[PDB]
Ligand binder design. Structure first.
Ligand code: CNI
Ligand code: CNI
Ligand code: ZN
Ligand code: ZN
Ligand code: ZN
Lengths: 258, 258
C-alpha cells in the first residue's frame, strides 16, 4: 500500500533538514527531489516513504557477477518501488529498469578551482600537472570508458590508471577535492551539480566550457511496474505547469550565495 | 512488413533534394530526420518508407470534434507505423501515442528581426507596437493557451484576440513575416528552428532571451506498437555514441551561412 521511494543524499536534491533530529519520517528531509516526490505522490494519489539508498550509490553493474548496485539495484531486486532522485537515463539502465521522460536536462561538465588554467576538455587531455577524475560508480565514468571521440579516449587512458585514484566515491568528495587541491585537481561531473556548487560559499569553483553531452534525469520504476505510466504523465504535467522550473529556481538560484 | 514512417517537410529535418524528380522512394529526401530514420531502421532491423504527412501538420486536437490531425493523427488512426520527425513530447499527445526518450532538447524561444527593441517575453507582454504570434496548430500555441504564469497568460490573452491574426500556418510563414515586417512582428517558436534560421541568409534574424520552457522531441509510435521498445533503446544508443550531436552539427552549423 505505502510506496517505498529510494533516493540519495545529494545536495540540493535530498538533504537533512537542520532540525532533522526533532523530526520523523519524510519530514526529516528537504530539497528538489523531496518537493518532487510530494507532487508526484499527490498527482498519482499514493502515500510514500523516503528511504536513503543503503550503499549511497546511483548504480552500476559489477563486470563479473553482472549484479546491479545503488538505486538501480534496489529497483531491480524489488527493495524499492520507485526512485525519485537525479538518476541519469542511460542505455544500460533502461535495459533493466523503466524511466519517465526527463524531469531535468543536463550534461557532463568540467569543474575547476578558480584560476585553474584549464578551459575545456581538450585542455585537460593535453597536459599532466593538473589531475582530473569522475565519480567512481555512475554515468560519467561509463561515458569516458566507452568514448571513441579522441580527446575523451585520451582522458580515459589517463584517468583509469592514474595514481593515486582520480575517482571519488561521492560527489561531495570530488567537490571537496577540487576545493582543496590548489588547482591541481579538476572534476568531471554533471552540469547540474556544477551550477549548484558555483553558487555556494566559499564561491571558489567554476564550471568551464559547454557540456560534453546531453541527457536527462528520470524517475525510475522496476520494469513493467504499474506505477510507470502514471508517473511519466505526472512528470509531463509538472513540466508543462512550470513547477519543475519553479523548483529548479528555488533550490539552485533563489538561495544562491555568490 | 515495410514500416510506414510519417514525417514533415520542415528544414533541415526533411527537405526535397534539388533533383528529387530524378529519384525514387526514400532517396527523394535529405535532412537530419532522413539520416536519423536510416539509423533507427538499421539498428531496429526494419525496412521503411518515408511518407510526408498529408495535411502538413505536427498535430493538434480539434476542440469541438476531439479528432487529432497531423502526424499525431496518422498514428492514432493507423495510417503510419512511426513518426520520425521533430515531434514535441507533450502530455496531451502522450495520452494517445507513445514517444521514445528525447532525441533533441529544446524550448520555446523568441525570434526577432535584428534591431527590434525586445530582450524577453516580459518585454513583448508590456507593449503593443510589436505584434507577436505562434504556429497555429502545435505545442507552442498550447503552451501559452494553458499557462498559468502571469507573463505568458497576458501574452495568450493578447494573441488569442489580436486582429489580423498573429498565428501562422507553417513555420516558414512565421519566419517570413518577421523578415518582412520591419521589426513589427516577433515570432515565438522552438529554439531549434530559431537557431537554424539565425545561421541562414539573409542573416537578418536572431534569437533573444533564454528559452521559456524545456522539452524534447521524440520518435512516436501508436500505443501498443511492437516497435516502441527497440526504437527507444536505439535513440539512447545513438545519443550515447555521439551520432545525434554529429547530426545536429551537420545540418545546423557545418553549413551555417552567417
Ligand atoms: N547531481 C548529480 C549527479 C547525479 C548523478 C550522477 C552524478 C552526479 N554528480 O555528482 O554530478 N551520476 C549518476 O550515474 C546518476 O545517475 N546521477
Ligand atoms: N523545428 C520545429 C518545430 C517542431 C515542432 C513544432 C514547431 C516547430 N517550429 O517551427 O519551431 N511544433 C510542434 O507541435 C511539434 O510537434 N514540433
Ligand atoms: Zn542527527
Ligand atoms: Zn501539483
Ligand atoms: Zn520539387
Amino acid at each position: 500500500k505505502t510506496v517505498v521511494v529510494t533516493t540519495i543524499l545529494e545536495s540540493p536534491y535530498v538533504m537533512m533538514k537542520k532540525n532533522h533530529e526533532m523530526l520523523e519520517g519524510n519530514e526529516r528531509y528537504e530539497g528538489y527531489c523531496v518537493d518532487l516526490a510530494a507532487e508526484i505522490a499527490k498527482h498519482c494519489g499514493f502515500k510514500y516513504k523516503l528511504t536513503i539508498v543503503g550503499d549511497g550509490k546511483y548504480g552500476c553493474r559489477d563486470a563479473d557477477t553482472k549484479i546491479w548496485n545503488g538505486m538501480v539495484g534496489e529497483l531491480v531486486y524489488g527493495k524499492a518501488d520507485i526512485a525519485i532522485a537525479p538518476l541519469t537515463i542511460t542505455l544500460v539502465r533502461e535495459e533493466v529498469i523503466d524511466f519517465s521522460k526527463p524531469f531535468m536536462s543536463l550534461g557532463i561538465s568540467i569543474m575547476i578551482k578558480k584560476g585553474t588554467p584549464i578551459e575545456s576538455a581538450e585542455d585537460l587531455s593535453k597536459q599532466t600537472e593538473i589531475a582530473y577524475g569522475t565519480l567512481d560508480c555512475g554515468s560519467t565514468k561509463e561515458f569516458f570508458r566507452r568514448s571513441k571521440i579522441a580527446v575523451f579516449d585520451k582522458m580515459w587512458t589517463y584517468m583509469r590508471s592514474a595514481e593515486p585514484s582520480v575517482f571519488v566515491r561521492t560527489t561531495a568528495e570530488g567537490v571537496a577535492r577540487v576545493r582543496k587541491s590548489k588547482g591541481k585537481y579538476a572534476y568531471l561531473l554533471e552540469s547540474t551539480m556544477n551550477e549548484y556548487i558555483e553558487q555556494r560559499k566559499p564561491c571558489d569553483t567554476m564550471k568551464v566550457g559547454g557540456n560534453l553531452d546531453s541527457k536527462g534525469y528520470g524517475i525510475a520504476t522496476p520494469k513493467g511496474s504499474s506505477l510507470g505510466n502514471a508517473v511519466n504523465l505526472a512528470v509531463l504535467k509538472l513540466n508543462e505547469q512550470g513547477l519543475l522550473d519553479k523548483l529548479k529556481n528555488k533550490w539552485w538560484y533563489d538561495k544562491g550565495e555568490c
